[PDB]
Amino acid sequence: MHDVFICDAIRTPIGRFGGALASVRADDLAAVPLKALIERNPGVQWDQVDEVFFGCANQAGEDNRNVARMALLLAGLPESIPGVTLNRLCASGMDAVGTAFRAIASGEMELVIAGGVESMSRAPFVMGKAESAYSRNMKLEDTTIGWRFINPLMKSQYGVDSMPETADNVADDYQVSRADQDAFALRSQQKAAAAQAAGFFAEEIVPVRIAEIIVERDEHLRPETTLEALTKLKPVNGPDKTVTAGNASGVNDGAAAMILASAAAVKKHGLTPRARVLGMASGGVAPRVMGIGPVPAVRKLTERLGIAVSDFDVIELNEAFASQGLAVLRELGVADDAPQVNPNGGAIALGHPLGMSGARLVLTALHQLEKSGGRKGLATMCVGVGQGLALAIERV
Template identity: 55%
Template sequence: MLNAYIYDGLRSPIGRHAGELASVRPDDLAAAVLQKLLEKTGVPGAAIEDVILGDTNQGGEDSRNVARNALLIAGLPVTVPGQTVNRLCASGLGAVIDSARAITCGEGDLYIAGGVESMSRAPFVMGKAETAYSRDAKIYDTTIGSRFPNKKLIAQYGGHSMPETGDNVAVEFGITREQADLFAAQSQAKYQTAKQDGFFTGEITPIEVFQGKKLPPKLVSEDEHSRPSSTVEALTKLKPLFEGGVVTAGNASGINDGAAALLIGFETRAQNMA
């Protein structure tokens, strides 16, 4: 069996919900990263066996198979297939694992794996009427959670949101509010140190954001999620999202927009390309 190796990779900046990248469609966001990755590596698009991208929503502008749509927008040949995988928060990692597995099995030489999401552009959706002339139209927000939750599943496992689940996990494992705030503050501090040390240099490719016909595109080149002012003292002043809980807007993971892609190949091919 062959060994799979990551040859190179790029990502967009990580945007906040309704932030700098909110106006960019997810397929355009992924396409920009794919295009820049091929330009950076000099690999011809026709050499790619498959493009596998993780994506959670898929029901809006993700257009069911965002990997295939994005690779075509990026200019790859129509002969290159695209596959979208969904393991929710682990979708991008699942795409990387699938690509590496395919290489070890000898199914191809070069794969592009990664993920994309635009939570800002997740649509509101309406279910179909159950009966003719029904006037019971329900609207669902697809940003987080199930689109159309199954009552049987809710009855068996509950329908808690991610913050509520965070509180449940904190209770189960004895995580205190102080520990959660300390971890969040340390995480922010580590990010700032990494940024100052140039850790992200060459990893982020700027994304062009349309500003109107009379203005040039705006280049977004830095992550939006960092909060340099985060301290334990500041975080302790925030109210929990749910009464008695430990999860706050300061110590919880945000809802983000962004895309990333890795070029993965087996050892001999990667050495030749280097």
């Protein structure tokens, strides 16, 4: 096995639906971090990149037909560089990092780029083909988020709960109160606003130029959030439920990318190694409670590595919904407000462009370890239709 080092990493700001990045095609957006990596790392011989791996949950729109390859070509990497796109919905960008790790670890590759993209603003409508001449049964479905082309067999066996519905199932089954979710959301807003003001996100961000407007800041943050404002919101799924627009992430646009390399490649390309990847693990759960998916993923990873959850100096836990973030922490024995968890806030504040988020969590965990002087970091997130993914790193 070879050690695998994460080197430079960079991301776009995250835009609101229909907001600052809505005019940027997914393929063009994915190319922005790749162009930045090139500019930032002048020792690299770019013809020696073995592969670009990108996560993307949609792939029906301008991200169609292997967006990783489209993006590397738009970014001006050589046409000799291959690319492949991953889809594990919400966890896609993290899967790209872990898959990139496995490829180097197994000695198949030396120098790779891993990232993720989503343009949920620009997600297309889809229409199935007619199954008979003169069919009257043609319909358009929205690919922005959630179920489309529903399978009756899936509905009858597992249900087709919307993501907020699953988050309410978790709140119910795991006993997570409305008040606890609102406090978690408020802390996310507060920590993200502080991190933004400190310039932490600015160090992770490459601005996007739109032909020229410059988009430099994450757009989704609500720094003025207060507990009173959150308490007044009506639950999405009816008055007896707990999940609201204020204690859940949104749909968003963004891209992120990072360099991974073997020891030999770090030396050859003049890279700065920042952390080594320890491992990645996945787990599956009932679709109806997909939010709890990180629990088996984290347990699998930590048991194989023999590292206690309490040993991590940062835990970046995706905040798809406060209810599931809290439920996961509670099962793993971590306090709802533990200082190592999401110290710069998370997706409730920052937004959630599905394919990008998992790459962002890895790069931000590493960034946070560097600033805090921490050693081990854990990134983990839930996945639609009942999965979890977890990835651990260690600063060098």
